[PDB]
Design a protein around this ligand. Structure first.
Ligand SMILES: CSC[C@H]1O[C@@H](n2cnc3c(N)ncnc32)[C@H](O)[C@@H]1O
Ligand SMILES: CSC[C@H]1O[C@@H](n2cnc3c(N)ncnc32)[C@H](O)[C@@H]1O
Ligand SMILES: CC(C)CC(=O)C(=O)O
Ligand SMILES: CC(C)CC(=O)C(=O)O
Ligand SMILES: [Zn+2]
Ligand SMILES: [Zn+2]
Lengths: 334, 334
């Protein structure tokens, strides 16, 4: 009796109000720099963080008080705030919403332009690659990054190479797990290389781990840095050179197979296109439509990837379903 | 055994991949004009809709095929598409994400400016009121609009007034339910008034329902149009004149009480600030922080609203919890 309208509405909205609010608070706070100071295991001290971020302290305090009202942080004492116990899961979920609604917003808002003159639209409406990187890392935290770590650590490698390694977090975490091991982080971006180069410094791995600043294409002609590696990792990278650079790509793959030490494998995480199964189909379709229609980059099915890795001379290929919908981890044994 | 990593990841992501993908597809499609042609009870014919929307048909077909892969539409025949059975619930959930991440995106991206010089930020970073209106209507579909309808229809009114009525859908639906009834839709926006004025035309209610183009403030001095109404409705409107126009507002409220026919009531849906209960607190906080910090509009608690309505001379005030988190429906009896 109008308690019906209420219960019916609650069931229809489900978790969407909570998620919409978490994602907006967390994107806003991350753009401010605040989210990197929130952690379930310690407090953020407003007086210091406001100074470190060059923000007015009363403004920062009203933000953290709003986030405290939302249940995302806990006010421990006066001027001190702690993230809620399940913050990292909430931030992981926010990553999916940030990626489709923020990182890829130029495609949402400008689809008509992309439909009528793609070449002009592709250069006019461009994605903010800081947002692409942050939301990808939030999604990866629980849905593909752990699986890649464990696989690399368990191979107990001596040399590990990462193509498109960014700030080299994955290499730093692997080297800190195999006490005797070396790493190579390859990235063609200047600022990415500069931050990876000092994060490795502050971990003391400045000798065990070098930060080469080249393209993955450059590997096709200079495969020297790949020599003798036990594991080569590429995360969501190889698709970005298809179909315009299929030969260069086929030849980087062939280079990787020859450069592998005995018993070594190339680990590729990438997205497969348009899955039909009920769990993955909806996010699969967004990942595929964004890549196929707006970025014009070719995503390959498992069948195509196995084909392509066989043709590069790998002797066996194992595909693993990742929790990230349409994410697959291909392990290509030499 | 690495089937653990998979099940753990799936539990951590929960419904977020599905929601993120639905919201992006549906905002993109709505901006294109396509979503208004999707319905669970009939098909969209691509050849005709592509022409009506001035879109290349192959482009429209790739979009609908992507949305079909996502499970949001069904391809009935060749060139014909039907929305999935629960489309309206999915679109309702997408409304929360659209509102926090799209409609209010100027606040997410520019919080630093709002913190350091508000007056300059408020006029530089402005919300797209087409996006505000669409996402509000998607949220309202299952979470506040039904409760307001049923209350108005059940009062069996002779005259109904709506302050900030937009395209007058709510009035059209009420007049089509009380066979003998009149309505007044008040809105100060030119284009809103022009569309309400022809939607009422195509319903034949062009006589029973007039579309006055004034401000709700203008009611404070010209209360004539309010005369004799059985029900006055205002949806998410009165807060937008607090605190800068408290006297004008207090006097519109007093005007409404005096203009009511005997047995009549004023129905106000509005948002209360920063609730603490577990269901509503997170979205409550986003609604409140957006209004308090970025729009500088005053949201009142239930206690304050009842106070304010008593002081305007209403004899009894009933507050109803809406499914929309922090939404409240206040019924103020004359
Ligand atoms: C994990 S995919 C994106 C990351 O990998 C880097 N990257 C993207 N494309 C390439 C490329 N062709 N070669 C080397 N690094 C790349 C980018 O600088 C970013 O850090
Ligand atoms: C339901 S809140 C927004 C809708 O109500 C209208 N509206 C907003 N503010 C006012 C106002 N002061 N007076 C009259 N209509 C308003 C807007 O034109 C829009 O259609
Ligand atoms: C995790 C990936 C899907 C990220 C990506 O492919 C991109 O945004 O470019
Ligand atoms: C449904 C309302 C919360 C919409 C609103 O207040 C706004 O965006 O201005
Ligand atoms: Zn990509
Ligand atoms: Zn508002």
């Amino acid at each position: 009796i109008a308690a019906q309208h209420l219960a019916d509405g609650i069931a229809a909205s489900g978790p969407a109000p909570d998620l919409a609010a978490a994602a907006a608070f967390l994107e806003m706070g991350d753009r401010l720099g605040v989210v990197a100071h929130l952690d379930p295991d310690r407090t953020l001290e407003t007086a210091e963080v406001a100074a470190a971020l060059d923000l007015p302290e009363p403004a920062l305090v009203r933000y953290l008080d709003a986030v405290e009202s939302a249940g995302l942080v806990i006010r421990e004492g006066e001027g001190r705030y702690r993230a809620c116990p399940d913050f990292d899961t909430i931030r992981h979920q926010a990553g999916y919403i940030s990626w489709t609604m923020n990182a890829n917003r130029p495609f949402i808002e400008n689809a008509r332009d992309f439909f009528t003159d793609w070449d002009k639209a592709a250069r006019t409406h461009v994605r903010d690659y800081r947002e692409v990187a942050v939301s990808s890392q939030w999604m990866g935290s629980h849905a593909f990054y752990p699986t890649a770590l464990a696989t690399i650590i368990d191979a107990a490698p001596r040399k590990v190479v990462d193509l498109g390694a960014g700030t080299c977090r994955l290499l730093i975490e692997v080297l800190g797990a195999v006490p005797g091991s070396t790493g190579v982080g390859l990235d063609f971006a200047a600022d990415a290389c500069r931050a990876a180069e000092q994060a490795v410094a502050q971990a003391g791995m400045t000798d065990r781990l070098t930060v080469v600043e080249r393209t993955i294409q450059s590997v096709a002609t200079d495969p020297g840095v790949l020599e003798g590696a036990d594991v080569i990792h590429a995360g969501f990278v190889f698709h970005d050179m298809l179909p315009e650079e299929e030969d260069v790509c086929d030849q980087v793959l062939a280079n990787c197979r020859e450069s592998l030490a005995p018993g070594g494998f190339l680990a590729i995480t990438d997205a497969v296109p348009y899955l039909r199964n009920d769990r993955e189909r909806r996010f699969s379709a967004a990942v595929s439509y964004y890549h196929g229609e707006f970025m014009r980059r070719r995503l390959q099915s498992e069948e195509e990837w196995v084909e392509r890795l066989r043709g590069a001379g790998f002797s066996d290929v194992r595909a693993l379903t990742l929790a990230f919908p349409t994410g697959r981890l291909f392990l290509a044994h030499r």
